Amino acid sequence: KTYVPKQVEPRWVLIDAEGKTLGRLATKIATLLRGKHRPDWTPNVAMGDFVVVVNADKIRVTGKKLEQKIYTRYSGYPGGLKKIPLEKMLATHPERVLEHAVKGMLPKGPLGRRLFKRLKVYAGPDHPHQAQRPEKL
Amino acid sequence: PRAKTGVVRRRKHKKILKLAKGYWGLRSKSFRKARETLFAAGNYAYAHRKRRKRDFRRLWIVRINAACRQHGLNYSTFIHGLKKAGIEVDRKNLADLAVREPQVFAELVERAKAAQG
Amino acid sequence: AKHPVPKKKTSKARRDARRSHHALTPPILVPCPECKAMKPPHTVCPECGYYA
Amino acid sequence: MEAKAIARYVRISPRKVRLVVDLIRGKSLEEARNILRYTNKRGAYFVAKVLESAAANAVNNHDMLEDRLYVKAAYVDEGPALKRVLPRARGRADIIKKRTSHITVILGEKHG
Amino acid sequence: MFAIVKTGGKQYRVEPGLKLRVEKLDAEPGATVELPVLLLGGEKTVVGTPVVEGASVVAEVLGHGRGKKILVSKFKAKVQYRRKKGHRQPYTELLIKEIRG
RNA sequence: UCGGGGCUUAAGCCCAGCGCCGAAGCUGCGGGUCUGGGGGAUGACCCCAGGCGGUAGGGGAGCGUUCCCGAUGCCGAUGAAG
RNA sequence: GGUGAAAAGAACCCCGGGAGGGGAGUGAAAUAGAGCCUGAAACCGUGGGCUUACAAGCAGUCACGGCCCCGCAAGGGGUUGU
Ligand SMILES: [Mg+2]
Ligand SMILES: [Mg+2]
Ligand SMILES: [Mg+2]
Ligand SMILES: [Mg+2]
Ligand SMILES: [Mg+2]
Ligand SMILES: [Mg+2]
Ligand SMILES: [Mg+2]
Ligand SMILES: [Mg+2]
Ligand SMILES: [Mg+2]
Ligand SMILES: [Mg+2]
Ligand SMILES: [Mg+2]
Ligand SMILES: [Mg+2]
Ligand SMILES: [Mg+2]
Ligand SMILES: [Mg+2]
Ligand SMILES: [Mg+2]
Ligand SMILES: [Mg+2]
Ligand SMILES: [Mg+2]
Ligand SMILES: [Mg+2]
Ligand SMILES: [Mg+2]
Ligand SMILES: [Mg+2]
Ligand SMILES: [Mg+2]
Ligand SMILES: [Mg+2]
Ligand SMILES: [Mg+2]
Ligand SMILES: [Mg+2]
Ligand SMILES: [Mg+2]
Ligand SMILES: [Mg+2]
Ligand SMILES: [Mg+2]
Ligand SMILES: [Mg+2]
Ligand SMILES: [Mg+2]
Ligand SMILES: [Mg+2]
Ligand SMILES: [Mg+2]
Ligand SMILES: [Mg+2]
Ligand SMILES: [Mg+2]
Ligand SMILES: [Mg+2]
Ligand SMILES: [Mg+2]
Ligand SMILES: [Mg+2]
Ligand SMILES: [Mg+2]
Ligand SMILES: [Mg+2]
Ligand SMILES: [Mg+2]
Ligand SMILES: [Mg+2]
Ligand SMILES: [Mg+2]
Ligand SMILES: [Mg+2]
Ligand SMILES: [Mg+2]
Ligand SMILES: [Mg+2]
Ligand SMILES: [Mg+2]
Ligand SMILES: [Mg+2]
Ligand SMILES: [Mg+2]
Ligand SMILES: [Mg+2]
Ligand SMILES: [Mg+2]
Ligand SMILES: [Mg+2]
Ligand SMILES: [Mg+2]
Ligand SMILES: [Mg+2]
Ligand SMILES: [Mg+2]
Ligand SMILES: [Mg+2]
Ligand SMILES: [Mg+2]
Ligand SMILES: [Mg+2]
Ligand SMILES: [Mg+2]
Ligand SMILES: [Mg+2]
Ligand SMILES: [Mg+2]
Ligand SMILES: [Mg+2]
Ligand SMILES: [Mg+2]
Ligand SMILES: [Mg+2]
Ligand SMILES: [Mg+2]
Ligand SMILES: [Mg+2]
Ligand SMILES: [Mg+2]
Ligand SMILES: [Mg+2]
Ligand SMILES: [Mg+2]
Ligand SMILES: [Mg+2]
Ligand SMILES: [Mg+2]
Ligand SMILES: [Mg+2]
Ligand SMILES: [Mg+2]
Ligand SMILES: [Mg+2]
Ligand SMILES: [Mg+2]
Ligand SMILES: [Mg+2]
Ligand SMILES: [Mg+2]
Ligand SMILES: [Mg+2]
Ligand SMILES: [Mg+2]
Ligand SMILES: [Mg+2]
Ligand SMILES: [Mg+2]
Ligand SMILES: [Mg+2]
Ligand SMILES: [Mg+2]
Ligand SMILES: [Mg+2]
Ligand SMILES: [Mg+2]
Ligand SMILES: [Mg+2]
Ligand SMILES: [Mg+2]
Ligand SMILES: [Mg+2]
Ligand SMILES: [Mg+2]
Ligand SMILES: [Mg+2]
Ligand SMILES: [Mg+2]
Ligand SMILES: [Mg+2]
């Protein structure tokens, strides 16, 4: 009968964002958010590392993107569809662009959100120097 | 000779109603609703029974692949090494060794890296 | 009957949930100074009277 | 111990009186008499009626101390409804249930 | 020490003194059968070739039995098709004793 | 809004290679039933090979309900039916 | 259409205007109390165990996990978080 892990401790990680290609980084970030790298992986628990990102304001992204490529929010009201280009996202709160990527990469369930909270993204550098600052690339 | 219904109907009913204990609302009180639900239930079980295997095969893979990843190679190549090295032993389930008794998993990694080339 | 009608018998759960706020509150009472008895505040009550 | 008292066939809807009963469940006999003494519902009269009888039974039959007993539990049950025909428009007609209640109140000694 | 052993088309990790339910074997209800099938150990037997040529695991057939019944309900809509089969899978319990190899 | 996120010496397109994932298909292990074929003199039973999605519909084998013979019987207050 | 073998149909006391109850008493039984044998289901309610207020649902099913409960015990029952 297959092994079930018990209450273990979350491994807090720290990733430097600047230079990294947006989507490419998000993918790995997501994987870390779930277990999926720890061989005691369990799909219904929440055991992914606490990823911390810094210098997110400096994420690289190929092609025209920034100019083109737009994020759309929808208010409930008529015409309530807002459209905001990648450019202006970074202009203001930029950690958004990475978050909206990692979030869209997490499973959509009630667990998915638990995990989305373990992801801490900052304009960086610097952040809550709690405990582990295990540089990672 | 007249054969009333009598016990017969009630009894066949109570049976199903037993099977439905625990279901939401009318679904565990009404015989007609109960049967209908059971119909669905039985079919689900039979199909989840088929899936259950297909489910663990997957779980194992990830756990194996996770251990292979930290051990240098990936799952794809790992299996190949093993499949080539004749070590048909490790059924993807028993590759739970990755979780406990890692030195054995490790031993099994080199055997695969050996069979590579 | 004519025009609008309920599309479905409301469930046991839905009914009672609606009746969430049905529970009435107990009366508010205070002991009058004259007797040890209980009376609703700001009200003269028989079996006692008043100080004019 | 505990003292029971039941008034059956009370000509009033259960759902209605039930509102009053829930008001005094667990309460002490003292605050209870008061809660009904000043509750603004028809059910009061009936629930009080059975509550006071429960008391009498408690003491005159079980040596229980009046000034020491509470409402260990109480509940109201539905009795056989009186169905009546209500003439309606365009000749249609329908029955209206003048429902009915079974009010039980069971008292009990405070502590020991 | 560990011991990966296959039987009844399936494999199991096994310690001595372990009780284990397995695909019904043909054996005296209280006899002794060693699973001439084996892979791995507590100190890495590691079966290069499929099996570990020269090794075995002694086990005492503790008894035979039948599993809890499972209702396999089949049902199709629009076409009044329903089937109810009761299924209890036969099995034999083993007691693992030696792991000599 | 390409299913989404997201992707630009690609996560796009084309050419070549190796490996892996994967369905109730196939394999293994156990069980069931049908048919054919083998021993069993034997009824029993075992062995081997193969078949078993299904509506209209045809065929086969059963389960339960009331009543009758079995009843001047047997069970039943140490408790019938329900 | 049905109390019970028999009315033995509940004196008397207690709460209540009464109804209806609580004691007492009858009976094998009163969960046989009078529309009274057995008393199924829908339906209504009281108590208790598990559970639920960031979550999108033919209401189940598969897995794991927690709480509660029956065998101190390897087991099983209830519940439902993911
Ligand atoms: Mg990856
Ligand atoms: Mg987004
Ligand atoms: Mg998921
Ligand atoms: Mg989905
Ligand atoms: Mg959502
Ligand atoms: Mg009929
Ligand atoms: Mg219900
Ligand atoms: Mg019900
Ligand atoms: Mg597989
Ligand atoms: Mg309710
Ligand atoms: Mg309720
Ligand atoms: Mg009356
Ligand atoms: Mg209450
Ligand atoms: Mg009254
Ligand atoms: Mg009295
Ligand atoms: Mg008494
Ligand atoms: Mg109530
Ligand atoms: Mg009625
Ligand atoms: Mg009118
Ligand atoms: Mg009308
Ligand atoms: Mg009408
Ligand atoms: Mg009505
Ligand atoms: Mg169908
Ligand atoms: Mg149909
Ligand atoms: Mg249909
Ligand atoms: Mg059809
Ligand atoms: Mg059928
Ligand atoms: Mg895509
Ligand atoms: Mg994504
Ligand atoms: Mg791109
Ligand atoms: Mg070409
Ligand atoms: Mg070419
Ligand atoms: Mg070529
Ligand atoms: Mg080619
Ligand atoms: Mg290939
Ligand atoms: Mg493959
Ligand atoms: Mg696939
Ligand atoms: Mg299959
Ligand atoms: Mg198969
Ligand atoms: Mg077979
Ligand atoms: Mg066969
Ligand atoms: Mg069959
Ligand atoms: Mg055939
Ligand atoms: Mg034959
Ligand atoms: Mg033959
Ligand atoms: Mg023959
Ligand atoms: Mg023979
Ligand atoms: Mg012969
Ligand atoms: Mg013959
Ligand atoms: Mg066959
Ligand atoms: Mg079919
Ligand atoms: Mg017959
Ligand atoms: Mg019949
Ligand atoms: Mg007859
Ligand atoms: Mg006779
Ligand atoms: Mg005679
Ligand atoms: Mg008998
Ligand atoms: Mg007797
Ligand atoms: Mg008996
Ligand atoms: Mg008895
Ligand atoms: Mg009986
Ligand atoms: Mg008589
Ligand atoms: Mg009389
Ligand atoms: Mg009396
Ligand atoms: Mg008295
Ligand atoms: Mg009096
Ligand atoms: Mg009156
Ligand atoms: Mg009286
Ligand atoms: Mg007494
Ligand atoms: Mg009495
Ligand atoms: Mg009874
Ligand atoms: Mg009882
Ligand atoms: Mg009479
Ligand atoms: Mg009468
Ligand atoms: Mg009556
Ligand atoms: Mg009843
Ligand atoms: Mg009744
Ligand atoms: Mg009932
Ligand atoms: Mg209920
Ligand atoms: Mg309840
Ligand atoms: Mg409740
Ligand atoms: Mg309990
Ligand atoms: Mg939110
Ligand atoms: Mg469905
Ligand atoms: Mg479990
Ligand atoms: Mg559990
Ligand atoms: Mg505890
Ligand atoms: Mg406890
Ligand atoms: Mg359980
Ligand atoms: Mg569930």
PDB file of N, CA and C in Angstrom, chain B residues 56-105:
ATOM      1  N   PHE B  56      -3.043   5.514  -9.724  1.00  0.00           N
ATOM      2  CA  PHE B  56      -1.800   5.252  -8.999  1.00  0.00           C
ATOM      3  C   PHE B  56      -0.592   5.141  -9.933  1.00  0.00           C
ATOM      4  N   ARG B  57      -0.779   4.521 -11.097  1.00  0.00           N
ATOM      5  CA  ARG B  57       0.299   4.433 -12.075  1.00  0.00           C
ATOM      6  C   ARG B  57       0.885   5.822 -12.253  1.00  0.00           C
ATOM      7  N   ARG B  58       0.004   6.812 -12.322  1.00  0.00           N
ATOM      8  CA  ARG B  58       0.404   8.198 -12.514  1.00  0.00           C
ATOM      9  C   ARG B  58       1.117   8.767 -11.297  1.00  0.00           C
ATOM     10  N   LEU B  59       0.492   8.623 -10.134  1.00  0.00           N
ATOM     11  CA  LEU B  59       1.061   9.127  -8.891  1.00  0.00           C
ATOM     12  C   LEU B  59       2.491   8.638  -8.744  1.00  0.00           C
ATOM     13  N   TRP B  60       2.663   7.320  -8.812  1.00  0.00           N
ATOM     14  CA  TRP B  60       3.981   6.706  -8.734  1.00  0.00           C
ATOM     15  C   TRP B  60       4.950   7.400  -9.681  1.00  0.00           C
ATOM     16  N   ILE B  61       4.585   7.469 -10.958  1.00  0.00           N
ATOM     17  CA  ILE B  61       5.442   8.099 -11.956  1.00  0.00           C
ATOM     18  C   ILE B  61       6.017   9.420 -11.459  1.00  0.00           C
ATOM     19  N   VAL B  62       5.147  10.310 -10.993  1.00  0.00           N
ATOM     20  CA  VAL B  62       5.588  11.628 -10.557  1.00  0.00           C
ATOM     21  C   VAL B  62       6.600  11.512  -9.430  1.00  0.00           C
ATOM     22  N   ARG B  63       6.284  10.679  -8.441  1.00  0.00           N
ATOM     23  CA  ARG B  63       7.165  10.483  -7.299  1.00  0.00           C
ATOM     24  C   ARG B  63       8.502   9.917  -7.767  1.00  0.00           C
ATOM     25  N   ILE B  64       8.451   8.930  -8.657  1.00  0.00           N
ATOM     26  CA  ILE B  64       9.666   8.391  -9.252  1.00  0.00           C
ATOM     27  C   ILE B  64      10.405   9.479  -9.995  1.00  0.00           C
ATOM     28  N   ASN B  65       9.706  10.134 -10.914  1.00  0.00           N
ATOM     29  CA  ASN B  65      10.313  11.180 -11.717  1.00  0.00           C
ATOM     30  C   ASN B  65      10.916  12.288 -10.856  1.00  0.00           C
ATOM     31  N   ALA B  66      10.281  12.564  -9.721  1.00  0.00           N
ATOM     32  CA  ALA B  66      10.780  13.569  -8.787  1.00  0.00           C
ATOM     33  C   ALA B  66      12.144  13.173  -8.235  1.00  0.00           C
ATOM     34  N   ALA B  67      12.261  11.907  -7.845  1.00  0.00           N
ATOM     35  CA  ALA B  67      13.504  11.376  -7.302  1.00  0.00           C
ATOM     36  C   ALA B  67      14.589  11.262  -8.375  1.00  0.00           C
ATOM     37  N   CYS B  68      14.189  10.918  -9.592  1.00  0.00           N
ATOM     38  CA  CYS B  68      15.141  10.828 -10.689  1.00  0.00           C
ATOM     39  C   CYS B  68      15.676  12.209 -11.019  1.00  0.00           C
ATOM     40  N   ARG B  69      14.802  13.207 -10.938  1.00  0.00           N
ATOM     41  CA  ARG B  69      15.178  14.574 -11.274  1.00  0.00           C
ATOM     42  C   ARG B  69      16.281  15.087 -10.358  1.00  0.00           C
ATOM     43  N   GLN B  70      16.134  14.867  -9.057  1.00  0.00           N
ATOM     44  CA  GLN B  70      17.156  15.310  -8.113  1.00  0.00           C
ATOM     45  C   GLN B  70      18.409  14.442  -8.230  1.00  0.00           C
ATOM     46  N   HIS B  71      18.246  13.256  -8.809  1.00  0.00           N
ATOM     47  CA  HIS B  71      19.351  12.314  -8.954  1.00  0.00           C
ATOM     48  C   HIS B  71      20.109  12.498 -10.267  1.00  0.00           C
ATOM     49  N   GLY B  72      19.801  13.569 -10.991  1.00  0.00           N
ATOM     50  CA  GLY B  72      20.495  13.868 -12.231  1.00  0.00           C
ATOM     51  C   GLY B  72      19.659  13.718 -13.491  1.00  0.00           C
ATOM     52  N   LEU B  73      19.218  12.496 -13.773  1.00  0.00           N
ATOM     53  CA  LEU B  73      18.436  12.216 -14.978  1.00  0.00           C
ATOM     54  C   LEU B  73      16.933  12.480 -14.789  1.00  0.00           C
ATOM     55  N   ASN B  74      16.139  12.133 -15.799  1.00  0.00           N
ATOM     56  CA  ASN B  74      14.684  12.242 -15.712  1.00  0.00           C
ATOM     57  C   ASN B  74      14.003  10.873 -15.729  1.00  0.00           C
ATOM     58  N   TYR B  75      12.680  10.864 -15.608  1.00  0.00           N
ATOM     59  CA  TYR B  75      11.921   9.617 -15.632  1.00  0.00           C
ATOM     60  C   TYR B  75      12.091   8.872 -16.948  1.00  0.00           C
ATOM     61  N   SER B  76      11.862   9.574 -18.052  1.00  0.00           N
ATOM     62  CA  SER B  76      11.938   8.966 -19.374  1.00  0.00           C
ATOM     63  C   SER B  76      13.175   8.093 -19.495  1.00  0.00           C
ATOM     64  N   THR B  77      14.339   8.712 -19.347  1.00  0.00           N
ATOM     65  CA  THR B  77      15.607   8.002 -19.479  1.00  0.00           C
ATOM     66  C   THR B  77      15.800   6.947 -18.389  1.00  0.00           C
ATOM     67  N   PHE B  78      15.395   7.272 -17.165  1.00  0.00           N
ATOM     68  CA  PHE B  78      15.502   6.336 -16.053  1.00  0.00           C
ATOM     69  C   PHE B  78      14.849   5.010 -16.411  1.00  0.00           C
ATOM     70  N   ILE B  79      13.580   5.057 -16.792  1.00  0.00           N
ATOM     71  CA  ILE B  79      12.871   3.843 -17.163  1.00  0.00           C
ATOM     72  C   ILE B  79      13.637   3.098 -18.238  1.00  0.00           C
ATOM     73  N   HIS B  80      14.121   3.837 -19.231  1.00  0.00           N
ATOM     74  CA  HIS B  80      14.827   3.218 -20.343  1.00  0.00           C
ATOM     75  C   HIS B  80      16.039   2.432 -19.863  1.00  0.00           C
ATOM     76  N   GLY B  81      16.841   3.057 -19.012  1.00  0.00           N
ATOM     77  CA  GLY B  81      17.992   2.389 -18.446  1.00  0.00           C
ATOM     78  C   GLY B  81      17.546   1.091 -17.814  1.00  0.00           C
ATOM     79  N   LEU B  82      16.579   1.185 -16.905  1.00  0.00           N
ATOM     80  CA  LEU B  82      16.073   0.016 -16.193  1.00  0.00           C
ATOM     81  C   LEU B  82      15.512  -1.036 -17.142  1.00  0.00           C
ATOM     82  N   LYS B  83      14.666  -0.595 -18.061  1.00  0.00           N
ATOM     83  CA  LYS B  83      14.060  -1.509 -19.009  1.00  0.00           C
ATOM     84  C   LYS B  83      15.145  -2.195 -19.829  1.00  0.00           C
ATOM     85  N   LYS B  84      16.214  -1.460 -20.123  1.00  0.00           N
ATOM     86  CA  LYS B  84      17.334  -2.013 -20.874  1.00  0.00           C
ATOM     87  C   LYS B  84      18.201  -2.897 -19.984  1.00  0.00           C
ATOM     88  N   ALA B  85      18.463  -2.433 -18.766  1.00  0.00           N
ATOM     89  CA  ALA B  85      19.323  -3.153 -17.832  1.00  0.00           C
ATOM     90  C   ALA B  85      18.687  -4.446 -17.335  1.00  0.00           C
ATOM     91  N   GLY B  86      17.521  -4.776 -17.881  1.00  0.00           N
ATOM     92  CA  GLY B  86      16.843  -6.014 -17.549  1.00  0.00           C
ATOM     93  C   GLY B  86      16.141  -5.991 -16.206  1.00  0.00           C
ATOM     94  N   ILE B  87      16.306  -4.902 -15.459  1.00  0.00           N
ATOM     95  CA  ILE B  87      15.671  -4.772 -14.148  1.00  0.00           C
ATOM     96  C   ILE B  87      14.171  -4.542 -14.263  1.00  0.00           C
ATOM     97  N   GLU B  88      13.457  -5.520 -14.813  1.00  0.00           N
ATOM     98  CA  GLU B  88      12.009  -5.427 -14.945  1.00  0.00           C
ATOM     99  C   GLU B  88      11.380  -5.374 -13.561  1.00  0.00           C
ATOM    100  N   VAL B  89      12.178  -5.728 -12.559  1.00  0.00           N
ATOM    101  CA  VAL B  89      11.726  -5.762 -11.176  1.00  0.00           C
ATOM    102  C   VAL B  89      10.838  -4.576 -10.835  1.00  0.00           C
ATOM    103  N   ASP B  90      11.467  -3.449 -10.521  1.00  0.00           N
ATOM    104  CA  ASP B  90      10.747  -2.267 -10.089  1.00  0.00           C
ATOM    105  C   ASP B  90       9.474  -2.140 -10.901  1.00  0.00           C
ATOM    106  N   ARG B  91       8.362  -2.512 -10.285  1.00  0.00           N
ATOM    107  CA  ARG B  91       7.074  -2.133 -10.808  1.00  0.00           C
ATOM    108  C   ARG B  91       6.894  -0.712 -10.317  1.00  0.00           C
ATOM    109  N   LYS B  92       6.428   0.162 -11.197  1.00  0.00           N
ATOM    110  CA  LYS B  92       6.407   1.595 -10.928  1.00  0.00           C
ATOM    111  C   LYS B  92       5.866   1.918  -9.538  1.00  0.00           C
ATOM    112  N   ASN B  93       5.103   0.988  -8.976  1.00  0.00           N
ATOM    113  CA  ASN B  93       4.623   1.114  -7.609  1.00  0.00           C
ATOM    114  C   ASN B  93       5.770   0.984  -6.617  1.00  0.00           C
ATOM    115  N   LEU B  94       6.486  -0.134  -6.704  1.00  0.00           N
ATOM    116  CA  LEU B  94       7.598  -0.431  -5.797  1.00  0.00           C
ATOM    117  C   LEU B  94       8.776   0.529  -5.947  1.00  0.00           C
ATOM    118  N   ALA B  95       8.710   1.405  -6.950  1.00  0.00           N
ATOM    119  CA  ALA B  95       9.660   2.508  -7.062  1.00  0.00           C
ATOM    120  C   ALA B  95       9.281   3.582  -6.053  1.00  0.00           C
ATOM    121  N   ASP B  96       8.534   3.165  -5.033  1.00  0.00           N
ATOM    122  CA  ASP B  96       8.321   3.965  -3.837  1.00  0.00           C
ATOM    123  C   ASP B  96       9.606   3.949  -3.020  1.00  0.00           C
ATOM    124  N   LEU B  97      10.534   3.075  -3.407  1.00  0.00           N
ATOM    125  CA  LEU B  97      11.846   3.025  -2.779  1.00  0.00           C
ATOM    126  C   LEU B  97      12.446   4.420  -2.766  1.00  0.00           C
ATOM    127  N   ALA B  98      12.161   5.190  -3.809  1.00  0.00           N
ATOM    128  CA  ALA B  98      12.616   6.571  -3.874  1.00  0.00           C
ATOM    129  C   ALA B  98      12.283   7.307  -2.578  1.00  0.00           C
ATOM    130  N   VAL B  99      11.105   7.026  -2.030  1.00  0.00           N
ATOM    131  CA  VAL B  99      10.642   7.680  -0.811  1.00  0.00           C
ATOM    132  C   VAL B  99      11.412   7.196   0.411  1.00  0.00           C
ATOM    133  N   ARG B 100      11.506   5.881   0.558  1.00  0.00           N
ATOM    134  CA  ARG B 100      12.250   5.284   1.657  1.00  0.00           C
ATOM    135  C   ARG B 100      13.170   4.207   1.112  1.00  0.00           C
ATOM    136  N   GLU B 101      14.368   4.119   1.680  1.00  0.00           N
ATOM    137  CA  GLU B 101      15.438   3.287   1.132  1.00  0.00           C
ATOM    138  C   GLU B 101      15.976   3.907  -0.152  1.00  0.00           C
ATOM    139  N   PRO B 102      16.386   5.181  -0.080  1.00  0.00           N
ATOM    140  CA  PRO B 102      16.870   5.907  -1.259  1.00  0.00           C
ATOM    141  C   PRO B 102      18.192   5.362  -1.793  1.00  0.00           C
ATOM    142  N   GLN B 103      19.046   4.854  -0.909  1.00  0.00           N
ATOM    143  CA  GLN B 103      20.316   4.279  -1.341  1.00  0.00           C
ATOM    144  C   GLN B 103      20.084   3.167  -2.361  1.00  0.00           C
ATOM    145  N   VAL B 104      18.964   2.463  -2.214  1.00  0.00           N
ATOM    146  CA  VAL B 104      18.574   1.425  -3.159  1.00  0.00           C
ATOM    147  C   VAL B 104      18.115   2.052  -4.467  1.00  0.00           C
ATOM    148  N   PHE B 105      17.321   3.111  -4.370  1.00  0.00           N
ATOM    149  CA  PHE B 105      16.911   3.813  -5.570  1.00  0.00           C
ATOM    150  C   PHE B 105      18.168   4.285  -6.286  1.00  0.00           C
TER     151      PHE B 105
END
